[PDB]
Task: inverse folding
């Protein structure tokens, strides 16, 4: 399988990489959070733009990005606007969404952008080519906050993400039973063993799916999310505890 | 489901209980190991009698048990002679095996005894009635050090163990692939959700199955084994790391 080297970090090799989400309401909050996160240990920083209230102005969004970039100029930065249909904080037009993403790619402020699969094939394809031309990596995603589809269906989505040029497919699902957690781990393993030719990120959310956030090295998930102060999705545990379990499982 | 309360410990409720194995070649070794183990934190102590080289004498075996009992009079004590066909250190006659077990039960020195399922139905049934009449609990076991049978076959064995009166069925299997580890977790969940009416202990051995020793609370295994100095079976990790992962997963 291929790996993705962002800055000095190699994704898809070794212990799963830890990603934390920064969530600020405005530039002052973003600024305060970026300075607080400097005292935490993680590998990739994801800025959840949907939590930013001034998304209406491209200049405000780019300015908040520059503030983050200045506080942690070494940390790979993932630019993520999570739409409300997929568990995010806000709803915006596809065109505004694409504009924010192309502008982030253009500015040279971010290392990766998150592009939702169901945005539309033609638009995602176009944005992917744009990201790559600017040397930016694409984490293509899909989230189901209500249930866990079959392993076969999840495997089909991850393969479609690869076909559309995603550098790192990502899928999050909501378990309704412990059985659903096993289905997610199974889909991850089949993906890693037979179809994946690049790093993949998967997770089962909520308390029941917590194990999927820890067993990444065993079943095939190249990165996992932990919480610094507050969680960006249900199930995330503190980064320090997440880091401890990963090392224990890695040196076992 | 029913729980098993050994001393002050409730098995089948809460965080999975940690069991460590004491392995001494002779009375002096057993004595040295028992005093060393006092500085470790675990819930149940399992004495692996098959590692004891003076098993020919019932008096020696009972004397080694009294030494352990005196060093840790509060810790639930599991008496286990593991035959070589199931990964143990020695081979003995069924009659000698039953004699050691009945003598251990008689002495009032142990809280639980391990009885292998494939010893013979009539003998296990008789030894089970004997253990119970003396208020001793039976951990009925089966181990496959070469492969992982189907989930349905594993579920069959665990149910047979319950039918023969086992207080705590236990099954250990060897994974040949990561898929085998998933089969073990699946069998554990099916068992806990549909058939189990008492605590069950399961595990997938080796490095690949390590996750099954950590995810007990999620899938249904009431106890897990950790190593103090040396492992009594492949895959066991240090008790302190095992204890850390269990608490993290428990408070998640
Ligand atoms: C994708 C999924 C998340 C999770 O399940 O941990 C975190 C979000 O911030 C991501 O964008
Ligand atoms: C049963 C199984 C073991 C394991 O797999 O950890 C430990 C042995 O000591 C037991 O008797």
Result:
């Amino acid at each position: 399988m291929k790996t993705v080297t962002v800055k000095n970090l190699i994704i898809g090799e070794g212990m799963p990489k830890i990603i934390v989400s920064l969530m600020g309401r405005d530039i002052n909050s973003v600024k305060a959070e970026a300075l607080a996160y400097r005292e935490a240990t993680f590998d990739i920083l994801e800025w959840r733009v949907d939590h930013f209230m001034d998304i209406a102005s491209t200049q405000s969004v780019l300015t908040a990005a520059r503030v983050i970039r200045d506080a942690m100029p070494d940390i790979p930065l993932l630019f993520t606007f999570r739409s409300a249909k997929e568990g995010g904080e806000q709803t915006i037009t596809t065109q505004h969404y694409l504009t924010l993403n192309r502008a982030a790619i253009d500015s040279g402020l971010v290392d990766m952008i998150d592009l939702e699969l169901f945005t539309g094939d033609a638009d995602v394809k176009a944005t992917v080519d744009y990201a790559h031309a600017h040397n930016v990596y694409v984490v293509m995603s899909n989230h189901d906050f209500h249930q866990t589809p079959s392993a076969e269906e999840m495997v089909s989505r991850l393969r479609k993400m690869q076909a559309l040029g995603a550098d790192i497919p990502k899928i999050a699902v909501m378990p309704q039973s412990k059985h659903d957690v096993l289905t997610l781990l199974t889909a991850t393993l089949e993906m890693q063993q037979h179809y994946a030719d690049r790093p993949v990120i998967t997770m089962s959310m909520a308390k029941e799916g917590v194990i999927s956030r820890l067993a990444g090295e065993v079943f095939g998930s190249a990165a996992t999310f932990g919480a610094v102060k507050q969680a960006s999705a249900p199930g995330q545990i503190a980064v320090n505890d997440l880091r401890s379990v990963l090392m224990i499982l890695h040196n076992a």
Chain A is about 40% helix and 20% strand.
